[PDB]
């Protein structure tokens, strides 16, 4: 039909087939309840002593027994494919966002992102089960019912059937007449309320003319002309049920008139007739249900076909081949333009970056907008738009992702934390890799070595959401060890650490020196003592980069670097 | 239960009492066909005889038409009722709404007045008229059911009366419990989500850890244990409904017991226990309507206290007891400050201007405001906060209302006209004081007879609401009219016209010329013309009169008086 996950679910049959044969007699037992009826109203209650009003107290809390269990069974194994189905889809979806470009997390339509994998994904399995089993069991209590209403006195059957539709059609003809003939009168009460309003608006020409007494008789006229028209909306509305009551009796009599004849006599007994009536009146609420499941199975299959949207969305761009053992080469830049998607205003003009191995560089971006995309680039998160990124010989692009990646480490205020405990977060994705020790050690080059050890569980405290959750400055010195533990050839400083803990935003900074020690370094200067520190300035205003050099020489002549060092204190 | 609305209800009560006791039959005729439904089966199906069974289409027919027309006699009268009483109330509304200062019309709107009016009085009346059709239907309705049930059966009906409520209890109290539970597994269920949200924004960190494994893994597991956590909840919601039904079915089980085991009652036949059991499940209509009346009534019975309010609100000051027929004395603003009630910037200061007899001493201004008031104290529709305005020497407040409006006339091209004709329009609220052709003699003094006589009937032709819809310039030449028939002594322009027809512009001009002849009147003037026309030129600036004179002297001494006008040029 519409969209066919189908092999998703084909693993789990089992679980839906044995809930649908459990659910069938979850209408099977209803059904065998009215049947239970006719003895009970024509043998039981009569003047017959017993042995139907004994036998029958008894089975009928035992099958609503069983119509119980069988409710609890279906509706626990639906649930079962639902959520053996809904969770490989969560995770199957998942599994394909964490392999796609930050463009899409780059609030193309993030915030939504949580509610896009939970809702649907509890939706289309939901609406998809719900038409199932409304499609099953709604869908066989018809079946049953209309078995035994043929098994109890079939010619009422027929002349019932037949009458039902021609009753509720000349029901639903007869009600949008009535209904028009209202909505066509509602329009001479708006206009007669029209008018009212314009008679309410002229105060101030009434006041000053004295009219008070002739306004009162020309309202006197439109009110009577208001409740007149009341009167006969009100009496053509109520003239309404009446007659749908009346049709609706006039079929009882007609179905009741034929029982009069030889026709259907001996079909009428004393219960056949209650359980064929009851049974046709249960049937409504089952077709009633049946006839909307169209609605349902499309918007569950519907919304699967909006996370398919999300499923097979843009990829990230993977074309290389080669790989990294050690990045020991000099980051070079040659008219590197780039213009970040989803937006007009071009972020960077050429570039001739220089970066040589061995020595670090510390940009500086007093404009403030739009800076850190320059790192961005050269860890491979928004695909260069013009230009090149020409590393150890070759360019990123015809370098594999996963080893650039590996190569360059961030480092920022608002670094993300993981949800398992700060020893592996320290060692995220290589904990393997690095002995317990090794680990520790990083916190020591960290300069946290005190905090992380006064934790209430040490080395293996959680350190994520239901945990300890640390402050900006101690995320900061984990970062800075997960550095050190990774050592990262190319680093990349957010700077953005705005606050001064006192005796530790130092220590914070002799880490920071202490890492940047070695290694080529890119810092987005923003603190004073980063911009002290700095090898080779690079200050950039807007999208260009105006002026390069060395601390001493953007200060001997002002140009950007030195105004800078002023409007900064 | 205010209820100051009695008196209203005495003189209709006739009806209401009507409507009641076809209410009551409207419900005896429910109740006489659940009674019909005991012979029919007991003895009318089974046997051979068909007597019962073959009248019974008869008797059906004829209740359900004895109820169709008592429902419609009920509703027909008591909307007659509720129609000549919110009828009476809405009259008595607008009654006392023209008794209304400006200030209160001003501060709400038409549409919210005409939503008092229109929809607050009609709430008040159906539902009143909704809270008696539901008491005494529903009441008449469970009076004869119980008289039914306790006649049919006296000991069936006392074991069903004492299992519901013990039954509808246990349901409430296990529904509770069970949504209790849901919920309480639904925080879980969010703890997860957010979770679930946390591993799933950090999109940046895992891409550059390349921990796309390990993130995949926690993913697996989180998601392992939300579909857990909603298996658990499904189970609980749907271990919910079984248990309610096993519930009711155990006390339909306990009844059919009760109705064997002993022989204590042991008279039921297949009829008494069919009616019986029908009356008390559709004994639950009437006793959920009779327990939710009380929203209706004191919902708009509190919509009559919120009429009340808006009816029994500040009246407009009638101070007053000299009546004055027509007077040349001036109008005088000594020491006269006002502010608009309801707004905080002052509207007016201790001001010198007079008017004097004959002279057409004008008044003009481009503060945007300040004149628009100065001319609405003399009308009287606001009040004067400080000063008084001395008419024949004598304060507006000590002149009687009625007469000292009659003594102003209001002509602006921004002037209501009432739903009425032409004739009626000119000699408004005085249609028997002035001659047809003295209307005629107005419409010639407008300069407008050409068009005046030019639609379809005439000098009746009808001109507001479903009428010509007629255009602002002639408009406001029959508002002159109206100022030339009435002779108004003191005369108060707007000539906010800003739109110069031609040949019909220049001929209003000439009407208000000979207008302006006599009839003193401070032009609000727009029209440079005006002002030159202007005798006593009169200039304020936003707070107070800057200059009062003749309009040479005015512009010879610029002040703020030229710099407006040339800007006006």
């Known amino acids: ?75 626990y194994c639906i649930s079962w494919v639902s959520g053996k189905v809904v969770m490989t889809m969560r995770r199957r979806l998942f ?153 609706a009796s006039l079929a009882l009599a007609f179905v009741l008139y034929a029982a009069s004849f030889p026709s259907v006599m001996d079909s009428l007994t004393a219960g056949t007739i209650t359980v064929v009536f009851s049974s046709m009146i249960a049937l409504m609420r089952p077709l009633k249900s049946l006839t909307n499941v169209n609605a349902q199975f499309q918007r569950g299959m519907a919304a699967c076909q909006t996370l398919f949207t999300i499923l097979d969305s843009e990829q990230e761009k993977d074309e290389g081949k080669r790989v990294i ?46 800076k850190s995309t320059i790192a961005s680039l050269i860890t491979r998160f928004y695909d260069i738009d013009e230009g090149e990124i020409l590393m150890d010989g070759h360019d990123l692009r015809e370098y594999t992702l996963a080893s650039l990646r590996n190569q360059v480490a961030l ?24 002995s317990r020790e090794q680990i520790e050690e990083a916190a020591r080059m960290a300069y946290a ?11 293996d405290t959680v350190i994520g959401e239901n945990g300890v959750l640390l402050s900006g400055g101690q995320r900061q010195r984990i970062a800075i060890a997960r550095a050190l533990l990774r050592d990262s050839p190319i680093l990349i400083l957010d700077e953005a650490t705005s606050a001064l803990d006192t005796e530790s935003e130092r220590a914070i900074q002799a880490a920071l020196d202490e890492l940047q020690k070695n290694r080529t370094s890119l810092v987005i200067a923003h603190r004073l003592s980063t911009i002290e520190k700095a090898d080779e300035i690079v200050v950039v205003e807007d999208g260009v980069i105006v002026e390069r050099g060395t601390h001493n020489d953007l200060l001997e002549h002002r140009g950007v670097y030195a105004q800078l060092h002023k409007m900064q204190f």
């Open 95 to 247: 599994g394909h966002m964490m392999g796609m470009p930050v463009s899409f997390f780059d609030k193309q339509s993030t915030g939504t992102l949580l509610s896009r994998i939970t809702y649907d994904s509890e939706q289309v399995a939901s609406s998809s089960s719900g038409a199932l089993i409304t499609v099953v069991r709604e869908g066989a209590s018809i079946i049953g019912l209309f078995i035994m209403m043929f098994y109890y006195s079939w010619q009422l059957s027929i002349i019932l059937i037949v009458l039902a539709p021609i009753v509720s059609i000349a029901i639903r003809v007869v009600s949008k007449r009535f209904r028009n003939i209202s909505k066509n009168m509602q329009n001479t009460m708006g206009q007669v309320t029209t008018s009212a309003e314009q008679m309410l608006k002229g105060h101030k020409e009434v006041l000053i003319f004295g009219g008070q007494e002739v306004e009162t008789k020309r309202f006197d006229k439109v009110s009577n002309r208001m409740r007149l028209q009341g009167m006969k909306m009100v009496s053509a509305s109520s003239i309404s049920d009446p007659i749908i009551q009346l049709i």
């Open 325 to 370: 053992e050690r990045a020991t080469g000099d980051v070079e830049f040659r008219n590197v333009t780039f213009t970040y998607p989803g937006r007009d205003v071009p972020a960077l003009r050429n570039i001739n970056l220089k970066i040589p191995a061995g020595k670090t560089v510390a940009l500086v971006g007093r404009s403030g907008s739009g």
């Open 449 to 459: 070595m005190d905090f992380i050890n006064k934790m209430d569980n040490g080395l």
């Open 411 to 434: 480092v920022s205020q608002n670094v993300h934390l993981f949800n398992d405990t700060v020893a592996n977060n320290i060692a995220y994705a290589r904990t393997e890799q690095y």
């Open 1 to 75: 039909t519409f969209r066919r996950l189908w092999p998703t679910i084909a693993p789990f049959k089992a679980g839906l087939i044995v809930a649908g044969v459990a659910l069938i007699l979850n209408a099977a037992s209803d059904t065998f309840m009215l049947s239970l009826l006719k003895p009970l109203l024509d043998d039981g209650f009569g003047k017959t002593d017993r042995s139907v009003l004994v036998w029958m107290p008894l089975v009928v809390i035992g099958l609503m027994i069983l119509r119980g269990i069988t409710s609890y069974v279906s509706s």
